[PDB]
A paper describes a structure:
DExD/H-box RNA helicases, from virus and bacteria to eukaryotes, play important roles in processes including ribosome biogenesis, RNA processing and folding, ribonucleoprotein (RNP) remodeling, RNA nuclear export, the regulation of RNA translation and transcription, and nonsense-mediated RNA decay.
DDX10 is probably involved in ribosome assembly. This fusion protein is involved in leukemogenesis. The 6th residue upstream of the conserved glutamine is an aromatic residue in most DEAD-box helicases. Interestingly this residue is not conserved: While phenylalanine is most common, DDX10 has a tyrosine and DDX47 has a tryptophan in the corresponding position.
Numbering used by the authors: 45 to 178, 181 to 278
The structure:
């Protein structure tokens, strides 16, 4: 297909240029698919937080973003909303393979992000899977998965020891809680993961804090990044 969805997508995209954060209080003030809006509304998410307001628009427009805001700010939806929309704009489906990698620092943090994604993205037609360790069972299922939520070590493992894993068609890389990723010692793991990905992609980096190392990474991982910070 689909001919109608192409028209709908085209209209959303014409409205990307007109995005103005001073006119945004609600998720529905951004130009978002009906499926994303339904999922947000069904999950009781209606008004945007400041970091969501200041980063979702730029991500919709295809830009690389470093978003910095303390814990509790709403960073998860700040990248998940753009993740869903990136694949929706392409009419991505389960047969299209790996479109988005979201990397979180620990198995519990990865799991928490995965749960938000499966609640808020439930009205979309993409597959989502969680890879966090704790084997071969995993590989069997994930070759077909559109959105993978991962921990850094397990992702690099899948990469190194799975012949069928490829990210040739990756659209977006997201680093969730990027300052913790780095403070755990995963800088070298991250660079190796990045060697296995296409340069052409969009990359979002979300961090709780302003650290030297995350700003350094924003140069290992990001193309002319849009820096955005929020406080108080
Ligand atoms: N737009 C919103 N409206 C109301 N609550 C929200 C919104 N976005 C996030 N939250 C809630 O605020 C809390 C923190 O969000 P979360 O993404 O985990 O923050 P962070 O990763 O920045 O620490 C969670 O309870 C989440 O459900
Ligand atoms: Mg978080």
């Amino acid at each position: 297909s689909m001919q109608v969805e192409r028209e709908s997508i085209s209209r959303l995209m014409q409205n990307y240029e007109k995005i103005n954060v001073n006119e945004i209080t609600r998720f529905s003030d951004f130009p978002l698919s009906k499926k994303t809006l339904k999922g947000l509304q069904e999950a009781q998410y209606r008004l945007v937080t400041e970091i969501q307001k200041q980063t979702i628009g730029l991500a919709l427009q295809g830009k690389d973003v470093l978003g910095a805001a303390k814990t509790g700010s709403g960073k998860t939806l700040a990248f998940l909303v753009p993740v869903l929309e990136a694949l929706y704009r392409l009419q991505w489906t389960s047969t299209d393979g790996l479109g988005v990698l979201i990397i979180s620092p620990t198995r519990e943090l990865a799991y928490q992000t995965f749960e938000v994604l499966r609640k808020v993205g439930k009205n979309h037609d993409f597959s989502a899977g969680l890879i966090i360790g704790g084997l071969k069972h995993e590989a069997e299922r994930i070759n077909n998965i559109n959105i993978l939520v991962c921990t850094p070590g397990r992702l690099l493992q899948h990469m190194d020891e799975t012949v069928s894993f490829h990210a040739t068609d990756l659209q977006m890389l997201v680093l969730d809680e990027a300052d913790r990723i780095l403070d755990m010692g995963f800088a070298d793991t991250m660079n190796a993961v990045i060697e296995n990905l296409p340069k052409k992609r969009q990359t979002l980096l979300f961090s709780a804090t302003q650290t030297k190392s995350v700003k350094d990474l924003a140069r290992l991982s990001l193309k002319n990044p849009e820096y955005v910070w929020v406080h108080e």
